[PDB]
Motif scaffolding. Structure first.
Motif, short mmCIF file in Angstrom:
data_model
loop_
_atom_site.label_atom_id
_atom_site.label_comp_id
_atom_site.label_asym_id
_atom_site.label_seq_id
_atom_site.Cartn_x
_atom_site.Cartn_y
_atom_site.Cartn_z
N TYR A 52 0.82 -1.20 0.00
CA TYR A 52 0.00 0.00 0.00
C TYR A 52 0.86 1.26 0.00
N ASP A 53 1.99 1.21 0.70
CA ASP A 53 2.97 2.29 0.76
C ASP A 53 3.54 2.57 -0.63
N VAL A 54 3.94 1.51 -1.35
CA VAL A 54 4.39 1.59 -2.73
C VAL A 54 3.20 2.07 -3.55
N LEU A 55 2.10 1.33 -3.54
CA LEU A 55 0.87 1.59 -4.25
C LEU A 55 0.14 2.86 -3.75
N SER A 56 0.85 3.83 -3.18
CA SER A 56 0.38 5.19 -3.07
C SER A 56 1.50 6.22 -3.23
N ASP A 57 2.71 6.01 -2.69
CA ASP A 57 3.77 7.03 -2.73
C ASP A 57 4.50 6.95 -4.07
N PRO A 58 4.42 7.98 -4.94
CA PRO A 58 5.11 7.96 -6.22
C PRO A 58 6.63 7.95 -6.05
N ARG A 59 7.20 8.50 -4.96
CA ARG A 59 8.64 8.44 -4.74
C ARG A 59 9.08 7.06 -4.28
N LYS A 60 8.19 6.28 -3.65
CA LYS A 60 8.45 4.89 -3.32
C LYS A 60 8.37 4.10 -4.63
N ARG A 61 7.32 4.33 -5.43
CA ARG A 61 7.19 3.71 -6.74
C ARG A 61 8.29 4.09 -7.69
N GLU A 62 8.91 5.26 -7.60
CA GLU A 62 9.99 5.64 -8.49
C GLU A 62 11.11 4.59 -8.43
N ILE A 63 11.42 4.10 -7.23
CA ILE A 63 12.44 3.08 -7.02
C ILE A 63 11.92 1.71 -7.48
N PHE A 64 10.62 1.46 -7.34
CA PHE A 64 10.02 0.19 -7.73
C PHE A 64 9.79 0.09 -9.25
N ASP A 65 9.63 1.22 -9.93
CA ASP A 65 9.49 1.33 -11.37
C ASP A 65 10.85 1.15 -12.03
N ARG A 66 11.87 1.88 -11.53
CA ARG A 66 13.23 1.83 -12.03
C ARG A 66 13.84 0.44 -11.85
N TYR A 67 13.63 -0.17 -10.68
CA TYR A 67 14.17 -1.48 -10.30
C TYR A 67 13.06 -2.50 -10.05
N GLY A 68 12.27 -2.31 -8.99
CA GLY A 68 11.32 -3.31 -8.49
C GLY A 68 11.70 -3.69 -7.07
N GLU A 69 11.42 -4.94 -6.69
CA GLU A 69 11.71 -5.49 -5.37
C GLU A 69 13.20 -5.36 -5.06
N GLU A 70 14.07 -5.53 -6.05
CA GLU A 70 15.52 -5.47 -5.85
C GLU A 70 15.98 -4.05 -5.54
#
Length: 77
Positions: A52-70
């Motif tokens: 939910y943290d990822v699936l709302s914070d675009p700066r958290k998603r920025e790292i998850f989009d660029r990389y993902g879980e890793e």
């Protein structure tokens, strides 16, 4: 193991915020310890809350989009 965030909330990197938040609002209400205090919904909600943290914070998603879980130091193990 292979801990999904996007897919634990039911998405892929390529979902927009308007897909992500669509799911997130539903997904909270699916297990909320303020709506469905169902036996074992709370741990479901807790595992959702990591996603939910990822699936709302675009700066958290920025790292998850660029990389993902890793890229994302949520929980480690």
């Amino acid at each position: 193991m292979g801990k999904d965030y996007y897919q634990t909330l039911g998405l892929a990197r390529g979902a927009s915020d308007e897909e992500i938040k669509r799911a997130y609002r539903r997904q909270a209400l699916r297990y909320h310890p303020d709506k469905n205090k169902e036996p074992g919904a709370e741990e479901k909600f807790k595992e959702i809350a990591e996603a939910y943290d990822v699936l709302s914070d675009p700066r958290k998603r920025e790292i998850f989009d660029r990389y993902g879980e890793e890229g994302l130091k949520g929980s480690g193990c």
